[PDB]
Every structure is written in C-alpha cells, then in structure tokens.
Symmetry: C2
Subunit: 130 residues, 2 copies
Amino acid sequence: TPSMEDYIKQIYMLIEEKGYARVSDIAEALAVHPSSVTKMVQKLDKDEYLIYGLVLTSKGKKIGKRLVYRHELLEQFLRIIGVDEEKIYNDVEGIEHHLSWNSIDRIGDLVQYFEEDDARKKDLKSIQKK
Amino acid sequence: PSMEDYIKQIYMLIEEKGYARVSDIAEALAVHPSSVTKMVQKLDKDEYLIGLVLTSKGKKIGKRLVYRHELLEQFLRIIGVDEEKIYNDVEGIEHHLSWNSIDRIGDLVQYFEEDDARKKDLKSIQKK
C-alpha cells in the first residue's frame, strides 16, 4: 500500500543515516502519531519486511532501496523537465505510489536520455520558450 | 482526488450522453449510489454543480481534468509504457501533479512530437 511504502522508505533512510530507526523518528519524519507508526510496524513485522530496534529483513532492505531509488529518480525526472524546485518533493511523494515498474523504467530511460546529452536539454528549453 | 474523479466522470458523461445519472456515476467509479449522492451534495455545496448540471466552475474544472488525463496518457505512451499499464497509472498520478509539472510534461510531449528523431533516440536508449 502507499502508506506501507512511505514507512518502509523512511525506515530505510533513518537506518542508513542514523544507524537505526526509532518509532519517534519515523513519527516526526511522516508527521504522524506514534500509534500510527506502531500499527504499521506491526503489519511490516507480520509481512516480514522487518523484525524487532527495528531491523529490516533482506526483503525490507531490497524494497527500501528500490523505494529510495524510485524517489530520487522521480525528483530527478521532474528537475530535468524544469519543474520549479519547490514543487518537486510534494509531487513525487504523491505520484510515486501510482507508477507501475514499467513507467518507472521508461522514466529511467527518459532521464538517461537527457542526462546523456545536454543539447537535448537545451532543445527542451527552446520548446518551453515557444 | 476523490472530488476530482467525480467531476471528471460527471463531465465526460454529460459530453457523452448529455446528462449524468447517479447510477452511471456509481458504475463508472465502482462506488455505491449512496456514496455518489453524498459526494454530489458536496459538489453542489462547493458550487461545482446544480437533473444535475455543472456550473461554469464545474465545466471549466471538468474540461481541465479531461485534458490532464489525456495529456498524461499521451506522455506515458510517448515514453514507451506498455499500453495496458497506462490508464491505471494516469488515474493514480493525475491527482498529485502540480500545474507546473503538467505544463512541463506538456512541453515534454511537444518536444518529442516535434522531431521523430528524438523518439528514435529514446527507443535506442531503452534497448541499451
């Protein structure tokens, strides 16, 4: 579920940054009540994404890494096509949960398409002026 | 999001049939008629509509939502998404893109439509 994804991603990021993931830190990151975190952590434990501080299983590690990649890729996509930086995080936080892997792969190809030659970015800019 | 899907469907039904029955909305969204009635009251109260007729505010929004939906399908289509995946993705992402992102996506679509070479170059990337 979208929510589950947000928690897995935040948990992965906390562990990578701090070394560990406190319920309290997840609550702050997501702007939710700790009860909401505790409930989700239970579903995550049950579904074998983590154990119990919280330690991701190999499945939870793989999934979290892909979720962070997806986020970064999506920000990079919106940045390249020239969306105002302030708007990017909010849009990615929403759209990330509704793109198939197929779309994400194709978006990956599109980002590499532009990154591989700045001249295509300049042409995109030229279109934006028109 | 919820309201957006309702206004979009209501608009399309009116353009398509000439009117929007609660039962047709219920079927289009896979919700129960009791939910449609509740929503319709909100849209009446929020002044998107007035059987039921969209106000100028409702018709302008419905048209924009339709444009955004079609634009997003055309975008995913252009960048090579399997046709069968496209609708479900558009129905989800459409609600969480700012106008800024939609306009840039539109520029991006025009970018590819201007030169078939650019599409050829993207297909080459995909193979690589």
